[PDB]
Amino acid sequence: RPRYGTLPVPNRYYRLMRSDVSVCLCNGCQHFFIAEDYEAECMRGSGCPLCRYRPGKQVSRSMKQILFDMETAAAASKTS
Amino acid sequence: KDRDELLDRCFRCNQLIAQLPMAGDRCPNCFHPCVRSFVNFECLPLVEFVLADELTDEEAERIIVSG
Amino acid sequence: DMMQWERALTLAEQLAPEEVPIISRDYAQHLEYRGVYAKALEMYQKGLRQLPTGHASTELSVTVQEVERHNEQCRQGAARSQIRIGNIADAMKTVKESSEVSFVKECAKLCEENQKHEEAAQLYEKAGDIERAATIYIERCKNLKAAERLLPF
Numbered sequence: 201r202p203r204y205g206t207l208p209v210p211n212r213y214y215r216l217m218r219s220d221v222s223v224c225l226c227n228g229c230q231h232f233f234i235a236e237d238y239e240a241e242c243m244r245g246s247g248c249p250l251c252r253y254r255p256g257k258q259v260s261r262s263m264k265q266i267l268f269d270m271e272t273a274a275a276a277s278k279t280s
Numbered sequence: 281k282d283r284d285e286l287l288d289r290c291f292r293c294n295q296l297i298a299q300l301p302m303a304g305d306r307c308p309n310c311f312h313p314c315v316r317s318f319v320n321f322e323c324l325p326l327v328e329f330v331l332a333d334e335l336t337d338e339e340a341e342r343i344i345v346s347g
Numbered sequence: 348d349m350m351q352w353e354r355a356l357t358l359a360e361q362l363a364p365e366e367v368p369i370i371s372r373d374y375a376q377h378l379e380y381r382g383v384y385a386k387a388l389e390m391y392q393k394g395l396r397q398l399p400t401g402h403a404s405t406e407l408s409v410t411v412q413e414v415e416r417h418n419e420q421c422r423q424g425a426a427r428s429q430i431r432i433g434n435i436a437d438a439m440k441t442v443k444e445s446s447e448v449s450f451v452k453e454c455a456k457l458c459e460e461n462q463k464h465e466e467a468a469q470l471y472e473k474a475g476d477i478e479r480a481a482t483i484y485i486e487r488c489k490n491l492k493a494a495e496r497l498l499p500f
C-alpha cells in the first residue's frame with residue numbers, strides 16, 4: 201500500500217514462490233527487505249535505514265522527549 | 281567467464297540476468313522489474329501482478345481472506 | 348524553444364510518439380498570430396488519441412478529463428480555422444454540437460465575409476444577443492423570416 205498520504209493510490213500485489221528466503225516490508229516505508237538483514241540494520245538506532253520507522257508506537261510520537269532533551273541541554277550548559 | 285552465483289535471477293521469466301539491465305532495473309529477458317532488498321540489493325523471489333479491471337483492492341483483500 | 352516544430356515532430360516520431368500531437372497544437376497557436384494557419388489543420392486531425400485502457404482506478408480516471416479538454420481545445424481551434432478556408436458546412440456540426448458561448452460568438456463574426464449568411468444567421472441568434480443579430484439582419488442579411496421570430500424580443 202503506497203503510503204503517499206491521504207491520496208488514493210491502488211495497492212500493488214506480489215507473489216512469493218520460494219519460501220526459503222525471509223522477506224519483510226517496513227510499514228513506515230513499504231519497501232521490501234530481507235527480514236534478517238532489515239532487523240540487523242535496525243539496530244543502528246535509527247529504525248528502518250531508509251525511512252527511520254520505529255514499530256510499537258503510533259505515527260505521532262511522545263514529543264515530550266524533545267522537551268526533556270532541551271532540559272538536558274540546559275543541564276549540560278549549567279554543569280560548569 | 282562470469283560466475284552465475286553473483287548474477288541476478290529474474291523469477292518471472294525464470295532466467296538469469298547476464299547483461300546489464302535497462303532503465304527501471306528491469307529484466308533483460310521479460311522486462312520484469314527486479315524486486316530488490318534495500319540493504320544488499322538482492323532480487324528477492326517476488327513477482328509483480330496487477331488485478332484485473334473487474335477486481336478491486338478491497339475485493340482483492342476480501343477474496344484473500346475468504347479463499 | 349527553437350520553434351522548429353517540424354523537426355521537433357520529426358524526432359518525436361521515433362522518440363516520443365505520445366508527445367507528437369501536443370507540440371503540434373502549440374505550433375498552430377503561433378500561426379494564429381500571423382494568419383498563416385491555412386496549414387494548421389492536419390495536426391489537429393492528427394491530435395486524436397486512443398483511450399487509456401487499464402484498471403478503473405483514479406490513475407486511469409483523472410487523465411481522461413485532461414486529454415478530453417485537449418481534444419475540445421483542438422476541435423475549437425479547427426472550427427475557428429476552417430472558417431476562412433471555405434469548409435463552413437463541416438465546421439457547423441462541431442459548432443452546433445458545442446456549448447461554449449464565447450467560442451460560438453467568435454466563430455459567428457467571420458461567416459458574413461465569405462457571403463455564407465445562412466450559417467451566420469444560425470449562429471447570431473444563438474450568440475447570446477438578439478439586438479445586434481437583428482441589426483445585422485436588417486442591414487446585411489435582409490432575411491425577414493428569421494427576424495419575425497425575434498420580433499417580440
Ligand SMILES: [Zn+2]
Nearest residue numbers: 226229248251
Ligand atoms: Zn522503512
Ligand SMILES: [Zn+2]
Nearest residue numbers: 290293307310
Ligand atoms: Zn525476467
